RNA sequence: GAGCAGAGUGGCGCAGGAGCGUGCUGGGCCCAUAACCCAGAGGCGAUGGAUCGAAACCAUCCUCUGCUACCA
RNA sequence: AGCAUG
RNA sequence: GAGGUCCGUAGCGGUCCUGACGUGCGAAUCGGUCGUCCGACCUGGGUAUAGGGGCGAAAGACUAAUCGAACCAUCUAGUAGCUGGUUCCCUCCAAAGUUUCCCUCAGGAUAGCUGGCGCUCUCCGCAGUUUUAUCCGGUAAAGCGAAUGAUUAGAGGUCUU
RNA sequence: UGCGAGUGCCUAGUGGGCCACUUUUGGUAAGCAGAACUGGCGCUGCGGGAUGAACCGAACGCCGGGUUAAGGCGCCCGAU
RNA sequence: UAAAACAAAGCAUCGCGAAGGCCCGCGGCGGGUGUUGACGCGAUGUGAUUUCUGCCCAGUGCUCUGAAUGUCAAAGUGAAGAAAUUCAAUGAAGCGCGGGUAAACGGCGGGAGUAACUAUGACUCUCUUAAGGUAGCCAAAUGCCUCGUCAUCUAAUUAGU
RNA sequence: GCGGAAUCAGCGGGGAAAGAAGACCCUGUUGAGCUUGACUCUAGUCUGGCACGGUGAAGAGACAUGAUCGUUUUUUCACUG
RNA sequence: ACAGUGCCAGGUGGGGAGUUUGACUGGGGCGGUACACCUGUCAAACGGUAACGCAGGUGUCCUAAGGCGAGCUCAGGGAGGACAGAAACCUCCCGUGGAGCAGAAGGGCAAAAGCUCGCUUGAUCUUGAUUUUCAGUACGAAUACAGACCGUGAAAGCGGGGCCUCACGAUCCUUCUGACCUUUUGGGUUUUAAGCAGGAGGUGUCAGAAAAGUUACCACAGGGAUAACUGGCUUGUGGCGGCCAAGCGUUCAUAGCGACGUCGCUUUUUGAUCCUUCGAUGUCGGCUCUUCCUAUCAUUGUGAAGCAGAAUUCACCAAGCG
């Protein structure tokens, strides 16, 4: 996503190749936006169980 | 500044100088049935979003103080609105300022 | 803006799957009396790759 | 050039009716030193004004540090 | 409980 | 005799010469030189996806020489404080770029400057002028042995420190 | 001293200005920027400044004669 | 403009046990994934192999629990009033309140003193933050000063190493 | 200062040469593409209320100084149409 | 009997829609407010008068710092008196204001407009007229009255805010106050609502829209009213050259130099301005080629040296040839 334009990407765009937003997003969300990690409870490396 | 709680000025409906009490007077609750706020409901009502303006843009810090004199005379209960010019901090009935004595 | 591909997938225009090859559905045989309260047999005939 | 911030115990800092930890001095403990204990001393960048009275408030100077200074 | 050095 | 293996035909593409041409053979072609050439390969036909939609190994790329929103008709003679144009003669009069207000500074409203039509009178009134009286002013000049603010140099006194 | 005055309607264009003697603010200065008074150019041709928007003279119906303004009178070129 | 761009295998997160996850659709017991079922479908980042992957949950996000003061719409309840009406209690989600998470977006200091010639300063004191840039690497396609300083390459090099 | 018909082959000084109502800059109370902590909305989605929408049995209640009987609010379990 | 559906209600909602994103300006941006006001000056002795001209101030403060009356006199200095002093308190003398009067500045003021006391609420109610900006419109502010009711003083008088010059705000909407007020529509009563008159809630872009960015993917109408490149005026800066003569040159101002001062030229630097050019005059360098200038490096001819020779400096005619 972040490799295109923003009309046809939320994560696009920039002069540089970066998401400029948090990844993580709500549940409901509109179609659209509902781009990235989906209601994420946790994220990072897994450091166990 | 600073007002004192009884003035002894002029009655309208007594023709005269009579003794009133002082008291600051404050802004009264909307009505939910006055004509321009039933006007604005019924056009606020459906679809088109917000319609009058509103207002963003304050510049004035300070409101001209209103003073409510009721007047003590016992049927006479005359009541006038009488404004003083504008002041950031006001009072009723203060204690009198006396000068010649350490501070 | 534009609609976005995760977005156009759902209208299965050239997201639909490629289904000639595939040999049928796997699928239980349906239950009866006889699965119901004894059993039937059956010989295994072939096994092939979908 | 224009904007902003900061000048105070030897050195780092707080803060309208001059202090902190460190440093220093003197005496304790110790064979002695550091550690520890008991005390003491040391001073609001300059000028003018408002206020009864200011390091603080308001202006002007002397230093210092940062942000800018685009577009052809 | 803490006890470094010549 | 394996390999998204190498050189290299056909095919597919399009590096460099910034070569040719550049009212061209051509609204993208030509030559030499080049990349790949058993694979994520090339290709006909059929078929599906249609405009704020499609499709995109992602360049805002392609969607009939049209794409950072195709084409056709209509609403529509859309709006323009902004450019350009605005058709015969003679006679008489003849300016303004200034005041106040406006999301006002390429524009208006308003006063001023103009013209036209008159009317009421005349054959007392007025004046971009002088004179005679009468007031008003604080500029040029001058002053600092006069106030305020500066500022140079010598004198004479004293106990005033 | 000079001169006929008063008064009412309707009204277009204009609302970019520029120059010069004296006064004058910013700026080193400017064919720079900004004001005061008067006159010009814009809207204006004509004689002179060789040439020129505003300089000097003088303002304009079509002509004949005469005379002047400012400026000129070796030749171009009218006039020592 | 053929590239350093995109893709790629690899790596790592996230959601979902089907009345579900993601998505289409004006609408229906509508439809795609799906002739599918976690070794799967869907959503992102980085980019083979080798070696590594430091610290920060203060900010902004995402997420888990609902009982303390809280707030909180419509409907319903009660009361007062002649009634419209007003008042009161009650009180969902969501915000606040309390945990987690950086292979989420992101972030990762300054000032003084000191070693027996100077120079550095391992060491000390101090103000401070959520943490104060760890391992590595460089005048780099990232360094203004800058044509940095040394060495090498040359007769001489703002170039190269 | 000077200048003499009509011409041919070359040439790139000049015609402030030609092409295109400057694409840079500014103005316009002209736009469009995109973004968000701009303003005003909105599809979707989360939650509450009323209707479809029934049958019982218990618990906690308001009722018609203890209990009973029958009116209703709510919690749980069970039933099916 | 809950999923679910129908209809309402609250939350979230750049996924999507519509729109806005001031002005002035030695181009625009950034900066600033010269956008609403006040004092001195500019400003040219009536009044008026500009620039991002100069020096400043304002969005307040005051139950008294408003209103009367009475009684006093201030800043400062001199001379004295236990502690006491540079500076506490007392006394006398001089003292035109050199003090104070809320604040910026200007004006004004001495048995007061200053200081201290006494009593008070003219900072109240009402209709007109006038001045200031001005269009002779508004607001704000101010001035003379007039009619009530009061304060104060023995009284004449003075007072409807602050000694004067600033300190503030329309339509619409809301809110409070006032009348034995009018309407609330076929008639009557009572709530309600609407009127009329006076205050308040504010628009600081201050005669008053409700409002964030980016475009190097860009478009349109125009603009030389307006920048970037060239040309023009100017020459601060850059470059070059003079005049004077403190000193240097072991002596010796001037062989060669030349401080402190001062006068010019040039348009090969940069600025300053914005006159021409936006219905287009092809931007830096290098290559190639021609010509011109002299402010002369070398070459020809000369003059002076702190010129013995050699080499080297200063100057003159001189751009022919390098
Ligand atoms: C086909 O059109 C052209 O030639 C191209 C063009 O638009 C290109 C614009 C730009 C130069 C900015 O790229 C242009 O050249 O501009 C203008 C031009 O047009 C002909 C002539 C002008 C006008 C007077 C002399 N000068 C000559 C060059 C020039 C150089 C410039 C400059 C402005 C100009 C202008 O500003 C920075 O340097
Ligand atoms: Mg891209
Ligand atoms: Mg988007
Ligand atoms: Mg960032
Ligand atoms: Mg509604
Ligand atoms: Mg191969
Ligand atoms: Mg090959
Ligand atoms: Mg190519
Ligand atoms: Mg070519
Ligand atoms: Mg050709
Ligand atoms: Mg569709
Ligand atoms: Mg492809
Ligand atoms: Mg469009
Ligand atoms: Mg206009
Ligand atoms: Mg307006
Ligand atoms: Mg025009
Ligand atoms: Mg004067
Ligand atoms: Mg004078
Ligand atoms: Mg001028
Ligand atoms: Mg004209
Ligand atoms: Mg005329
Ligand atoms: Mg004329
Ligand atoms: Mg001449
Ligand atoms: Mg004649
Ligand atoms: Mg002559
Ligand atoms: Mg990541
Ligand atoms: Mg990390
Ligand atoms: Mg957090
Ligand atoms: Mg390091
Ligand atoms: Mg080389
Ligand atoms: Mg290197
Ligand atoms: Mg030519
Ligand atoms: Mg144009
Ligand atoms: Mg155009
Ligand atoms: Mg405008
Ligand atoms: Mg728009
Ligand atoms: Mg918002
Ligand atoms: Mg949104
Ligand atoms: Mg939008
Ligand atoms: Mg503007
Ligand atoms: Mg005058
Ligand atoms: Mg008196
Ligand atoms: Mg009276
Ligand atoms: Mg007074
Ligand atoms: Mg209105
Ligand atoms: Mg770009
Ligand atoms: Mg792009
Ligand atoms: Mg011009
Ligand atoms: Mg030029
Ligand atoms: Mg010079
Ligand atoms: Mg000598
Ligand atoms: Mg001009
Ligand atoms: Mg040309
Ligand atoms: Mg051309
Ligand atoms: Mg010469
Ligand atoms: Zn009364």
Redesign the pocket.
């Known amino acids: 996503?972040?490799?295109?334009?923003?009309?046809?990407?939320?994560?696009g765009?920039g002069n540089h190749?970066?998401?400029?937003?948090?990844?993580?997003?709500?549940?409901?969300?509109?179609?659209?936006?509902?781009?990235?990690?989906?209601?994420?409870?946790?994220?990072?490396?897994?450091?166990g169980t | 500044?600073?007002?004192?709680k009884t003035?002894?000025?002029?009655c309208?409906?007594c023709?005269?100088?009579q003794p009133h009490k002082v008291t600051q007077?404050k802004?009264?609750?909307?009505?939910?049935?006055?004509?321009?706020?039933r006007?604005?409901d019924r056009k606020q009502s459906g679809?088109?979003?917000?319609?009058?303006?509103?207002?963003?843009?304050?510049?004035?810090?300070?409101?001209?103080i209103?003073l409510?004199l009721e007047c003590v005379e016992p049927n006479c209960?005359?009541?006038?609105?009488?404004?003083?010019?504008?002041?950031?901090?006001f009072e009723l009935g203060?204690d009198?300022?006396?000068?010649?004595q350490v501070? | 803006?534009?609609?976005?591909?995760?977005?156009?997938?759902?209208?299965?225009?050239?997201?639909?799957?490629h289904?000639?090859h595939?040999?049928?559905?796997?699928?239980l045989r349906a239950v009866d009396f006889a699965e119901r309260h004894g059993y039937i047999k059956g010989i295994v005939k072939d096994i092939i790759h979908?």
């Open positions: 996503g972040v490799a295109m334009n923003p009309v046809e990407h939320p994560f765009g190749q970066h998401i400029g937003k948090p990844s993580t997003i709500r549940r409901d969300a509109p179609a659209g936006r509902k781009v990235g990690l989906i209601a994420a409870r946790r994220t990072g490396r897994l450091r | 500044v600073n007002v004192p003035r002894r000025t002029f309208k409906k023709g005269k100088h007077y802004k009264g609750k909307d009505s939910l049935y006055a004509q321009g706020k006007r604005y679809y088109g979003g917000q319609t009058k303006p509103i207002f963003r843009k304050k510049a004035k810090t300070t409101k001209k209103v409510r209960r005359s009541k006038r609105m009488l404004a003083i010019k504008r002041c950031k901090h203060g009198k300022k006396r000068k010649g501070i | 803006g534009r609609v976005i591909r995760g977005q156009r997938k759902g209208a299965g225009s050239v997201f639909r799957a289904v000639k595939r040999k049928g559905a796997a699928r979908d």
